[PDB]
Design a protein around this ligand. Sequence first.
Ligand SMILES: Nc1ncnc2c1ncn2[C@@H]1O[C@H](COP(=O)(O)OP(=O)(O)O)[C@@H](O)[C@H]1O
Ligand SMILES: Nc1ncnc2c1ncn2[C@@H]1O[C@H](COP(=O)(O)OP(=O)(O)O)[C@@H](O)[C@H]1O
Ligand SMILES: Nc1ncnc2c1ncn2[C@@H]1O[C@H](COP(=O)(O)OP(=O)(O)O)[C@@H](O)[C@H]1O
Lengths: 497, 735
Amino acid sequence: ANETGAFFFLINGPEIMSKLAGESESNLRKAFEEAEKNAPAIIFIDELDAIAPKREKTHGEVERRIVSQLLTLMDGLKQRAHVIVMAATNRPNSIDPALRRFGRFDREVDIGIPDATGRLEILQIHTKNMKLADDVDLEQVANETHGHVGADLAALCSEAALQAIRKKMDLIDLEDETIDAEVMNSLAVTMDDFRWALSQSNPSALRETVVEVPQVTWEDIGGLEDVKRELQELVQYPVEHPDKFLKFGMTPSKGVLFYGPPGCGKTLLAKAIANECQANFISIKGPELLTMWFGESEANVREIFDKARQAAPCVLFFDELDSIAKARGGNIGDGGGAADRVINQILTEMDGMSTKKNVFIIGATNRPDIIDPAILRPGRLDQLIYIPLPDEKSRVAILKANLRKSPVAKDVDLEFLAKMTNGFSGADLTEICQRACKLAIRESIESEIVPEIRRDHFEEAMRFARRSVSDNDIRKYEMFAQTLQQSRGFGSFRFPS
Amino acid sequence: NRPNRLIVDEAINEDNSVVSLSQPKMDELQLFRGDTVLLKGKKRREAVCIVLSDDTCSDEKIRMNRVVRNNLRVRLGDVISIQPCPDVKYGKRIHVLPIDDTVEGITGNLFEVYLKPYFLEAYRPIRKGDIFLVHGGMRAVEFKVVETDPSPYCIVAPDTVIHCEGEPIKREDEEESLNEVGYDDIGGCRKQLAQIKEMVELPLRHPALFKAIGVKPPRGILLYGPPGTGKTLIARAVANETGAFFFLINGPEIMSKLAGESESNLRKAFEEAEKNAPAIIFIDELDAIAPKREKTHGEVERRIVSQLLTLMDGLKQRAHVIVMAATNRPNSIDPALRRFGRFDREVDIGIPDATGRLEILQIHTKNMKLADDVDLEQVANETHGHVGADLAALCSEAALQAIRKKMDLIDLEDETIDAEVMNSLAVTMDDFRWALSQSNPSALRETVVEVPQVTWEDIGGLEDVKRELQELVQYPVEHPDKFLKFGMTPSKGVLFYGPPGCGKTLLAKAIANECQANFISIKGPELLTMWFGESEANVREIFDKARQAAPCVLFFDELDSIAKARGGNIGDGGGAADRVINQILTEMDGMSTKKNVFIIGATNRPDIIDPAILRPGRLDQLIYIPLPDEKSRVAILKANLRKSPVAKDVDLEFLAKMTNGFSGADLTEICQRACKLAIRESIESEIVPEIRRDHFEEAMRFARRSVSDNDIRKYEMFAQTLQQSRGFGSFRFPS
Ligand SMILES: Nc1ncnc2c1ncn2[C@@H]1O[C@H](COP(=O)(O)OP(=O)(O)O)[C@@H](O)[C@H]1O
Ligand SMILES: Nc1ncnc2c1ncn2[C@@H]1O[C@H](COP(=O)(O)OP(=O)(O)O)[C@@H](O)[C@H]1O
Ligand SMILES: Nc1ncnc2c1ncn2[C@@H]1O[C@H](COP(=O)(O)OP(=O)(O)O)[C@@H](O)[C@H]1O
């Protein structure tokens, strides 16, 4: 509003209720009237969830009067002059549905927490006024923070400035009325201040939905070339060539569900597919899906699809989809079957969605024998992909992907190390590397009283090699995959004509 | 740049005006140890004090006492200058003249029994116009001389004489009443006050510095803790000693008046503070102001809440003001008040531990002198659930019992009371016992957040796990750069299992003391209280209180205790998850690993824990603690036998080797039974304070064996299955 030559008028949320009843509505009415005279103008409401809590409050005679006054003032906004009404809130469910009718708030926009590439920018956009040192960078400090609101970072910068100036103002002791500018500019900030400020900071949005752009590509996942082509030919073709799908007359697929042994990077391929297609990514993990099975609140699963469809294109990810069945039993469990208050909510919402929208649903699970057949019905989740244990040639790439960040010596051989594992999944290799690089630090610290790993740290690290995927689950998964595949009898046949 | 300035910091000594400096300062200005030093302050006045050498406080600072604080008109966070004065001073006469501001209700001679025992064996220089506090007679009174010999040349010596008149003078507004609360009047909380010291001292002592820069200072600080923790006193002290106006509105003074002007009073409270800049605003009770969670009643309640929100949303730069608020629980505050620019900064105050309650004892009982056999160290150990105000109330009530046992037989019925007998009202051991037994604690069921008092010497043996715990949680903190260089993250939690009764809490408590961090305790019964309560919001802030008091460690006891009430491996139609398992790991999934926090999981049966908890990323470290060996039980028994006297003929090596299926608790119960049976013989022989060998054979009769042979194999097969180091235990790489 300030850079369009239009008048800006701001009423936040409580300045209306602060005054006595009777004139609060008059102030709101005159706020709209004064803006019309200064056309073009704009109206912004900072807080509105405190204005119209018409869901569970049901108290106060003047509250509904103010809500109705606002509704009347905006229903009556004919052409006349040029004005735009802006409103801000915290959650979409904290707004009176009567305000969402056409002509009042028919257009909506959602703003999420920025990712690393966004928090990096918000760093300098606030710290530009202070010069930094030659060894202080904002790229690495923006990576540890993941749950900080955009205002959290600005507050962190301001607080770190105070710590930076405090360590010198005590020994300077410049007690005077006025202050010169020849010394206020030399108040540089160092590494010791951001660490303390970031450790002392208290994040605000830590449990909101994780809607960010991932930072992993196909190079981070080793092997698994069979599924890469299947995922590449399924979700990019309908977007890059929409006309070909419309010409034949059929609709593209809406979701892909895969199963396999736990610890095979079932989240990595779902995250990497978003980066190469230049789209957003959402994360609905198992614990995030068990939080409303007990909460008796089925309204929270309602807007997780709305926030995904608003940020089109996007992809929906579901982790350990059968994790709810473990708390309820399984194949038999209690007197019930394989459905509950949350299974019937997952598919009811995605049944009525438009396939034309640039959205995708990914279902990850470990045991496919517990999932109810209703989910796997043709039309919602028909694509089934089974990921087996990684081969010998794939584990080399898997290990070298994880060993990219840590320094690697020249005598480190990986081909022999990868071929000596048979019943080891993806997580078993990562934990071995973690143990080795942790044990390296112990020798470095003990020798202090070298920044390079050697071959001696390996033999002591493979001692703690764990084998989570036993032999009982391998056959159980193979018999299910073969039963669900069924390509026998007519695998090779030539048509006469 | 006149290299003589010194920063002002609060001292730690509880003596008279004695300053503390560092070791290079002694040779910087050629002073000796026992010399008289002169200090120069503002308002063109001098002072005299004594230098004390210290090497532990800091590298470059001074530690100046409360007397000369107000004597020299110097507040915390200011400049000061010091200089030697090797001049021989021999005082000859002094004028005594108290001020009637605090000398009320006290008659008789208060100059020959009150100031006399305090001046001897002190050798403290005095100056014309000094303000110092002294104790005696269940109260305290300051002193001020208006006309005496011209300073310097005043030293406390027996040859000096005294003379009194008996006409107090009227005080003026030039000085400040020292009877008010200072910074040293708060005890039991050192880490919490240091945060305020670096949060409030800058915007108040340096208004133009913040008015000239673009840094936005905090506009609101929220105070936590159970009622009576001392939230009001902290706010009163941080404002009275900064030269800033203090305005207090508690909680109900707004709702007491008729509707319509309550909002006007709140509005004018903010406006009057702006004129007296710099100023401060403190709200004693706010949970009663904005109960916008479940009340949903009252038309004017939301009006007052919105008025407060509007008044603090509109707080632009203009002048310098800090709004303080206090409450009882973080969940009793309107979330609309927690937005940025209103209460973005929060601080939590917990119940002090033994080392804190000890300090709060003398900080209140300093005004009464004690006996030679009455100590506050032992009496502060039995109390664990007492609020900081509980201890002050206990001291006041114990004073009443101490005076009652003599006032009946004295029977001094008169209008006025002399000070020659009110000072002789000493308190003995019989009064604290009765007062502590009759006292009613307030916070007994709050979260136990204190610093433990156990070290590695209290746990015998178990050297295998000591190195594993030492190389896991101290290395990332002491050497953060090494973990960042490799590019991987340190571990976030360690879960261990084993037979019950092996000190699964002792190693979790001892690891906090050697790392100088706080410790929290979430036991099994504390974890089963919300499985039935149907309230999942209480597990929400137990992590917030732990992360605010960084560094800290989270401890979980008998983690599978919930599964016992629901079954176990099979149980009901469900599996191994419920309304509380899914809340333990969901909150710790999204936490930042960079924070100095740790999670410890203790359990007895590891076959019942759901595999979701043990997933790589949340709790991946598994340690199995077996039964103690023969060489470890000797240390285990001697750790428990440290407090009780031990005879010279007591052999422990043979006593430890004769136990095979005995866990840690089985040895402690044997020692408890033996030392209890010792008291029976001592009492029976009364009609000796040393144990003998006869009390043992009668005590091992009641030896119990809780850990049977069925659980040992069950735990060993699980540990071996979860370890799996066979097949590739010894292999040499070719290259
Ligand atoms: N092809 C692969 N490339 C890179 N990492 C892999 C691959 N397969 C498995 N991993 C590793 O396995 C780990 C487990 O990932 P996760 O998504 O939790 O598996 P799951 O699908 O069982 O959830 C990941 O951290 C990942 O590094
Ligand atoms: N930590 C403490 N240090 C010194 N005195 C204390 C402390 N805690 C309580 N007191 C004493 O007990 C009283 C507790 O009252 P106060 O803390 O002001 O109310 P609240 O506990 O609601 O903040 C104080 O007035 C003070 O005299
Ligand atoms: N190594 C040890 N050193 C000292 N005490 C021990 C040791 N092992 C066990 N104990 C004793 O066992 C008792 C039980 O401790 P506790 O933490 O309750 O065991 P658990 O881990 O089974 O809960 C403690 O009071 C402690 O004195």
